[PDB]
């Protein structure tokens, strides 16, 4: 399931 993108890598 898609959980979006995080602002950290």
């Amino acid at each position: 399931v898609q959980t979006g993108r995080r602002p950290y890598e």
Partner: antibody
Amino acid sequence: QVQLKQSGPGLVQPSQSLSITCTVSGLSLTSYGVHWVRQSPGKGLEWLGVIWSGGNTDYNAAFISRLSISKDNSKNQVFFKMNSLRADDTAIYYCAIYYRYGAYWGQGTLVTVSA
Amino acid sequence: QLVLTQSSSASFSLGASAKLTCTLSSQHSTYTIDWYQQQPLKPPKYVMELRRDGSHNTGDGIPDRFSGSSSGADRYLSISNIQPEDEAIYICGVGDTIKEQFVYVFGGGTKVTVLG
């Protein structure tokens, strides 16, 4: 500890350019992305763009035509540049670095767009 | 559109238990969000990462009385025994890939007033 120190002039004449440097001490930009964010008086936080550790970028589409972010890994500095400023570009501008789980923030640059 | 919805303000009595809501756009109901606490004219402070099963990771300098939970599109920040020090603007944030590009967006912020 980690510190993000912003520098650059804050007064900008309408239609001129805004340049801000973010100097990062205590961690390496080869490992972290740096975001740029701004808040204008009672108008909420706007995300502007980011430069990732590898040097690639992503920009808010409302700003990509006039916004540029680049960096110098050896100096540990990030350069934010926005052209053609208008009255409503008046805001405090912040650099930010996220990690698991938290964020470091620059002190902010108060930007006034005025003649 | 990727949109976070928060009420602009909320009020709680001293010592009460408070809950703030951030609602994700329907097509993004499974997304992880960030909560932030902000004082006027200051950089925001990171509060927590909050995932869709309601589990969370709290940032540095955040006391035990803060926690998070989820319910479908809703993300909650709970503060038990709400203190005057908890008066602040609370903001949620979320990232995504949209047309091959990273985007991040903030909610409008909720101003918390502690009565009494």
